[PDB]
Amino acid sequence: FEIKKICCIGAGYVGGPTCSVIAHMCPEIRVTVVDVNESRINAWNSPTLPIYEPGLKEVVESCRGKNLFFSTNIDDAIKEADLVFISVNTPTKTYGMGKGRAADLKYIEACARRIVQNSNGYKIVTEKSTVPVRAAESIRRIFDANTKPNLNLQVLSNPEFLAEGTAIKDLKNPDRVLIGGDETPEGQRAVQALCAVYEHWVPREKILTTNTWSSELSKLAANAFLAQRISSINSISALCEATGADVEEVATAIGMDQRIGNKFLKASVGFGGSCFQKDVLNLVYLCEALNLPEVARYWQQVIDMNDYQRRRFASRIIDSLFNTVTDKKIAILGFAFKKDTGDTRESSSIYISKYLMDEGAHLHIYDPKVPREQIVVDLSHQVSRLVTISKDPYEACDGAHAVVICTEWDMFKELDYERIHKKMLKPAFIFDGRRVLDGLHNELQTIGFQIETIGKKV
Amino acid sequence: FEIKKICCIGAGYVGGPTCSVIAHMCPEIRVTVVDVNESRINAWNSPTLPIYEPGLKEVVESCRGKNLFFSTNIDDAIKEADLVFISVNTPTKTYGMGKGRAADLKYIEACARRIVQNSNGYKIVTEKSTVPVRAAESIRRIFDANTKPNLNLQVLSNPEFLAEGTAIKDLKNPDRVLIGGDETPEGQRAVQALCAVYEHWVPREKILTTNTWSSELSKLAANAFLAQRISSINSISALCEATGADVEEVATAIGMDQRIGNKFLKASVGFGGSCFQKDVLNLVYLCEALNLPEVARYWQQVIDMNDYQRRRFASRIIDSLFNTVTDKKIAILGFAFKKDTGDTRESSSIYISKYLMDEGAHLHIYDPKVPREQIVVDLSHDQVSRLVTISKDPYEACDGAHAVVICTEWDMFKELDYERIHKKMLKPAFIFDGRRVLDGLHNELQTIGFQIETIGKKVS
Amino acid sequence: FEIKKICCIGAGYVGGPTCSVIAHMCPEIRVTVVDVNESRINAWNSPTLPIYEPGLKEVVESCRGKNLFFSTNIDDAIKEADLVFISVNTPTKTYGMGKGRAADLKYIEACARRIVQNSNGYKIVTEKSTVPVRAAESIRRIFDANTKPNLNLQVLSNPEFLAEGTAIKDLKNPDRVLIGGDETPEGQRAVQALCAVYEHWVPREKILTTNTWSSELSKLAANAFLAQRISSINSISALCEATGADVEEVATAIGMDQRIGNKFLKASVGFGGSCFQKDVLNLVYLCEALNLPEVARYWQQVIDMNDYQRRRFASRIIDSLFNTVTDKKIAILGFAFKKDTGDTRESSSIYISKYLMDEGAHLHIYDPKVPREQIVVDLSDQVSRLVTISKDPYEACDGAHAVVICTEWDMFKELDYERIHKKMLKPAFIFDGRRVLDGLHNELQTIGFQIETIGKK
């Protein structure tokens, strides 16, 4: 069996770029991306794509209309497809059992029911989005319970490891392509057919085939391990402040051990983004549901440490300002969860800001990329009375008691702090939650700034 | 400052090989290794060295008598030295505050008092063994309180990262050389003098200079991070058994992410050795002493997960044998904490064996390298005499056994004649692979008739 | 250096009476009291002072216009002052870290910034109001970070120990005057300069000079020790009810030991007022912030015992009325936290009333001095339906099932209880929460009451 027609249900940041790269590297394969938002599909067929990714516009326009297509006729695309990707988002449950930690499979289930209704003959159905472990069994149960004569649907797991901003680079040169299928002979045929698609541009040595459950678990575990590295170095940063050690020196010394590696060992006020906490919490919920409390509380520590790092950093700020910041102007520099993005999901800036707002602080927030409306929404259920969004860092720092750096924007390293210090109220504090002012502490102290930072003793 | 004479106090597993390599790569530096055991010093000056390390004999005999010397005259070696290494072992405290977790600084303190009494002029004193964080502050306090006119002792931290069996390779090609000293100008002079010693064979790019506290903490943190990787994959292995996932597939998929790396992602019945648990526990005690309970309980999970992995594996064995193993013969294959060593310190085999002995099992224990006496001592506080038998070959231990428990990843266990083993085993016959060494044989073993259970794979 | 001009920031019940006595006993020292409340300053300059304190009017009028002045020109008074008193209120924090227990230093910080902006030359700045320990360190940090050439500000702690109603008596004859300053030579000069002011009417032996931290802690510790004595005797009162002992007999026996003393050994439903619980809670929060959980939980017991005494007393009332007081009329006699005042802050009557209101009781509250509006606010739909404020005790007790005495007013001892008993529903109960009816129990029982009281079985 040769895959010639691919349908991806979901034109988001996973289904879009992934199938765009497939059509780019597989000219013979017809790739149709379908979705429910007519605005999205129209945008995908427009000169301005509904998502910005470097190289995506170059990739899409060189394939769109030839073998890459975007449409709203999901039923027709499903019927003709040989391979159906399921790329709908699985949001965290908002209520009920597993609220806040379990994944809500309602979209995947809705997708599976739609697929089985519009499918005849042999097809391969592949989970692309991050799913909870054993979710493919739910898809197979739906397929089994709604079977038709000569209808043979094979379910595979092919989790995506792309990152925002570098999706195209990650898709064209992946660290590994993970494909999971049943150990049965029919499942292995489906696995090889999907492997043959990736083999057009991915070396065979980087294509790892596993069972379905291992593939689903590996996606969760990878993000949990990464978050754990950050929580671990953050735990050391608290110890460094207590001992006189420096977390950057420790991290450099740790990372030179080749068995540990030097990536993801940067201490910070806390990890953010829409993947790390969500995946760890889903891992914790899975363990609790499987009667593995020891494993659950093990991985809960990654989240607990991340929360502790934020609370501790906020408490240092409050304690430094005499345990009272009511009506005190505090400049928050950086609101994105990391530099060079507008994404604020689970940004440590949100939690630091909320803690200071709980104390009645007047926050003046500057971020070069996060739009003004996003900041208000994230801080909103108070925001009108306590939060001001500044146009430039000097506006936020004027008349402020403290400057809190929550995102590692490169521009913050280049601010005219002598100018900032003149208009700040004294004593003037800088709280570097990202270690971006290292090497400037001597100059800042001579200017007259009390500089406090993560993982360095005061 | 030019270091020309080096004295290492402690001729053990750290002080010996490290100073041997220094004299090898620094022919012009006189290196004297001193100790309190006359047998050790005599052994060091003998054709059979008191510790076996590959290439150590070649290194030592090439330098011994030229610029490497072993002696018991600690006072004279201290007086003439420009650099004094402190390589005495810091054992865990047996009683009092921090029992079982805190380090006992009595030897380092005794060494520091010995140094200050026999030292005149400028000297550099360097902690080489694993010390608790802020231990150098205690050495400096002793030096300050016992100061002499024109006596200037500089204290440095230079923790060792050598591994037993490959110390010489690690010393000649280290991943990094860590040197910690005071940020004061005098401390920086001491740091550069020790850096200049390492620069004879270590590139300056791999020599990392920090403050003293960062250097002490980095040694503890590195071992804690490594142990954490093992505990993390072991936690996944429990999940894999619950879900039908396979921990080896997950670990391979995890380790292909370059940010994570593929080292130290082998699921097992639990990590062992004299380093991992000791350092994590010392890290936990340090955090508790510094009013950081959140950090303490964070790192306690690494130990708790490792203990849970052993208990769970033992409980699977007991449950598989009908929750009764009284008088049941069980073959334990492998007793060392890892393959290719005789070291049993904190070996998972010990804890698995103790759990089975708590149930009255008759353990027949085979290890190709661990001597018989060590096994008895580790399992001993009557119970060992009645319940434990040390076999001389694996087939002797498996004859008439209900279960074969593989606790160490010895390569020979992969090559055993299991069909021969299965004939003489009592039925049902179980194999518990606690190291994943029988992967790829599970099909053959099941056809032979072996109920094969292993870490991180659901029971088939 | 001799102090000649004194400015007190805050014209409240601490800054006002204290500086009034200073100007009275130091005619040659110019004393200016400044505040933001224009009404307060105008009231201070009026024949009706903004606060009633016995002997204050004679003291103020004997000095006002000569060397005691009240003004709103804070900047001018600060600049000329040799000694600046900081007497602003430090209320408990309402939100954030330490909500309900930590002190809110925002006013002290605002005052310190105001002082440093308007100050030139040598000055002595003195905390007079109850501050958390280490607060003077924050003032010194502000002064250090906002320094000027030749500007030398010395920070001292001079906590107040006056009590409302007897402030003038306590100021003129203090048990002790406490002054805390840096052990540095410059601090000792500031300490002696303030000591020289107090020495005009305070004997040198009663002026205790300590470091700043000791002075701040002593103020908190003194109130905590006092609260502890009450909680301790209240804990014994629960024991007495369980054993047949009498807490008044035990308290008398305890207090005759000279090492213990006979003061503050009166069992009650619970201590009240704006100082005791506030000081203990601030002490507890201070311990928790300083990683001393053992000390924190030690002093938390004082508050926990005080809460338990109120809850237990309310539970006895409810249990005596068949565990149901819905729509039952209950007369609450006394609402102030102690007799002979209108102050209801942390009054045990509030908490007993709230417990009875939680059970749907119809409370008829009488207090001879607490105004009607204060009672409503303190208990504040529930107050409108369940609470009635009575004009006289007989109105409150008419048709009531129980009479709850929560404040030790002397008039309650002299009520016509036979008249009360006739119109009460039977069985009729009297819950004496202050032991004010001792010696009347035989008469009350013969009348037909079931009299229950603290510390008696």
Numbering used by the authors:
A (entry chain A): 2 to 382, 390 to 466
B (entry chain F): 2 to 382, 389 to 467
C (entry chain C): 2 to 381, 389 to 465
What's the publication's text?
Processing, refinement, and image reconstruction produced a 2.06 Å density map which revealed that the major class of unliganded hUGDH is the 32 symmetry E state. The cryo-EM structure also shows that all the NB domains are rotated 11.8° to the open conformation. The cryo-EM density of the open NB domains is less ordered than the rest of the structure, indicating domain flexibility. Additional evidence that unliganded hUGDH favors the E state can be observed in progress curve analysis, which shows that the unliganded enzyme no longer displays the hysteresis observed in hUGDH:UX4O. Since hysteresis is a result of the slow transition from the EΩ to the E state,14−16 the lack of a lag in unliganded hUGDH indicates the absence of a significant EΩ population and is consistent with the cryo-EM data we have presented thus far.
Human UDP-glucose dehydrogenase (hUGDH) catalyzes the oxidation of UDP-glucose into UDP-glucuronic acid, an essential substrate in the Phase II metabolism of drugs. hUGDH is a hexamer that exists in an equilibrium between an active (E) state and an inactive (EΩ) state, with the latter being stabilized by the binding of the allosteric inhibitor UDP-xylose (UDP-Xyl). hUGDH forms a hexamer arranged as a trimer of dimers, with each chain containing a NAD+ binding domain (NB domain) and a substrate binding domain (SB domain). What makes this allosteric is that the binding of UDP-Xyl changes the structure of the hexamer-building interface and increases the affinity between the adjacent subunits to form EΩ.12.
